[PDB]
Amino acid sequence: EYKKHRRTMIISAETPRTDRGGDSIGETPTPGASKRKERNRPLSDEELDAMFPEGYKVLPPPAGYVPIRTPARKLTATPTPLGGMTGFHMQTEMKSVNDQPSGNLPFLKPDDIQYFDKLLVDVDESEEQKERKIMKLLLKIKNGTPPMRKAALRQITDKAREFGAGPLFNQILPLLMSPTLEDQERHLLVKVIDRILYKLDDLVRPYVHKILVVIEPLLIDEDYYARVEGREIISNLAKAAGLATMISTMRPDIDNMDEYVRNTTARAFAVVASALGIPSLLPFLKAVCKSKKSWQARHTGIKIVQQIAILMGCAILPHLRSLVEIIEHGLVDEQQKVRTISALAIAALAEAATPYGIESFDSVLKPLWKGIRQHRGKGLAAFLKAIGYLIPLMDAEYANYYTREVMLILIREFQSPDEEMKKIVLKVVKQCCGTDGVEANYIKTEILPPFFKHFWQHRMALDRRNYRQLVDTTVELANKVGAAEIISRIVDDLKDEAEQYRKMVMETIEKIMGNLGAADIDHKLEEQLIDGILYAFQEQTTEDSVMLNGFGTVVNALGKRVKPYLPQICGTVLWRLNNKSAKVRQQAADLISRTAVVMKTCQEEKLMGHLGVVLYEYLGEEYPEVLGSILGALKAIVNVIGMHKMTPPIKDLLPRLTPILKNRHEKVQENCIDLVGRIADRGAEYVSAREWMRICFELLELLKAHKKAIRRATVNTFGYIAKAIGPHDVLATLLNNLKVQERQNRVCTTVAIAIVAETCSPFTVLPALMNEYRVPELNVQNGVLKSLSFLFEYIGEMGKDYIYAVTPLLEDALMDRDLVHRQTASAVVQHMSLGVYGFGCEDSLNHLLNYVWPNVFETSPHVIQAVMGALEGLRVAIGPCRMLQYCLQGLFHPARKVRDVYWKIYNSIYIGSQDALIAHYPRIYNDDKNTYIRYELDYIL
């Protein structure tokens, strides 16, 4: 209900401020009248002319109906109490209407008509009215098919400079202001505002406020991506407009009655200050916080200091002093808010103040400590927040005293029902008691019993932030007082009813035993541990890692102290390994996966028999989400017990795996391909070649995967089996693909050609490929070009020979059939050029550079960036001198194009190797006013 005041915001300097004064004065008039004694307040004809847009008439009908409208009020009571009714007669019976009148015109929601009504009328073809009329391409962006949204979006991007910001925003801001607005539609209009604001710069100046009013509500939002977007577009707006534009714009919102606009406005100043930098905007602020008019302003400006602290964060560091010098005067102010928010802003500062600038906070302290005594309520807690973040920044001697003073109040204040309180004092306890200069026993006595008393309760854990922060603080207390204490007190709660609580203590134990190590733990408490962890693990309402990673970390930390507990574990593991069909199978499986090594090193072989054949049996499970976890478990078991010792000998296993690859879904596909990879890489002899080549012809279509890691493991496996067999057959099976499917992974086969060419010497393979460029089918031609590219990228030095072989073919390819040839071939020239460096082959690379050189000119992004990479690699390989000898004449050529490009190149050549260029600048004669000959080089002994 707090945010919906957005709906009350009408669309959009001395006049601007003059308006706020009148606004507040009318507020005092009305408010005053009631003491003297909303949207329904009667209106005036100028106010009436204010709302409706252009082109409407208020002409009435006769002089006997307006008096009916005046008696209507009296007759709303009177004639409603009178005779009336309606009826219908049976009689036999034109029907006009309008949807969107256009070629297609994707559909209009019943409300959006109000906005898009002008498009409905079909009157056409007779100035500005036609620009608003054609601007309905918005409608195509809002609703329609995704392609319509794309093409529309571009079309309106390139028309920015044409239409101007005025008509656009005039036709947009109502939509982005719409009460019925979607999520997506919002986000899309945000996109169009960005893309048009990458172009328009000086133009937006009148509309800046008129923008921010809608945009500032994006900064305060439940969605995160909405927030990062909002900060981005306000960054683009402020940087886009001028500083003075922003400043002079946004003043009147500081004293605005509603605090909402003040707040979101503060975050606005935070964003713009990130844009244009702190020092530029300082005098504005420093002027604001000293404003003597009213407090609300200073409250705002201080909040601005804060949000600057959060946003800029670590980068505040240089101006920290000046900022402090601003804020300090509010701590002593008579108003309360200003004090509270002030000290809070100090907190945010210090928290972004990484272990330094302590003396900059210096003058701030002595009041704060004093205040620590006398305060009741929220302000107190706020001070505790500030001081809390401060203490890590002090000296362990001064902070000794000061800390020991804070500990008292810290103790006393555990018990307040305020959750803000508990957050603050919590994080405080972290920083104060996580100090190296604090003594264990003092904490053990004074703190821990009240800490676990008041803080560990079922109010906390259900909340999110309190959950996390609690976890952290407890973790650190463990970091000091030791392990067995904390854990020993919280173990008994593993068996507590609720989940979220169990989850909490479980992850706590996890992190604790992660850091300190399990060595400190005694015996009995360890029994309660393992039993606790099993018990909690046996009841899982949701699927999550916390319990699992928890268990794994506990066991791997215990080491072989866990050995007596195995049979109970794995008994539970099998029985659970049935029980829950889709729920728990995957989970018990993963439990095995993470417990593998522990079930290995202790040398329980029967257990490996168990897991081996038992898990072997589930490979016929039809549920994928289970089967995946099963294969994962098998994987982990392979990494502990070796090839020849597998209780399910690979002869059994692998062909039993082979048919599963039709599973498609990554869940089974991921782990499966992984395991086929481990076995195919490691042993690889156990299986006959026929099985392997079948595996190949099955692997071929795994490249339709929508996931990148699937293709990853796939290609690497394909290399492994390429080693298991040898090149020619399998690279031929790769060349069987004509790259007809451009979706999923196509070039991936190309990568397989590369890695295959590595696994056994390409010194064998190349002639087959180079022959296969002959084929008239073009896309596979550019395919084998890519194969050369990745090929040289992987081979590196070994290309000192094959350069020659590839050289004439690159000649044929680089000579252009179609752009992709020039591009890909150019990439080949690049990776070749980095690879061969320094070995003395430069000549042929120069020859190829000839044919490279004409391609310099084009607007296609991929070919121009390709050519850039090309000429960069050629720069390092050939040496700059030859490059520059191609780049000289282009610098000063009359045309703009040639200069743009040759200067881009010459820059690329210039940044690197700027040291070595000296010799190669030619002799340039000296003119009248200037001496252009460097005579130093002509000094002769």
Partner: protein, 55 residues
């Protein structure tokens, strides 16, 4: 403000490399000095063409 081609060819020591489009540059003396270097390469012939060197 722009010199003619005959005045640019009479002033240059190597007038066998001057073109008709070099008079429209911002500094014809530096372009004529850079075009008459020892191991310099000329620009491509697609600067005035409309076929994009591949059609």
């Amino acid at each position: 403000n722009r010199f003619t081609v005959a005045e640019l060819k009479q002033l240059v020591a190597r007038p066998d490399v001057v073109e008709m489009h070099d008079v429209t540059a911002q500094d014809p003396k530096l372009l004529v000095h850079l075009k008459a270097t020892r191991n310099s390469v000329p620009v491509p012939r697609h600067w005035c063409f409309k076929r994009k060197y591949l059609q």
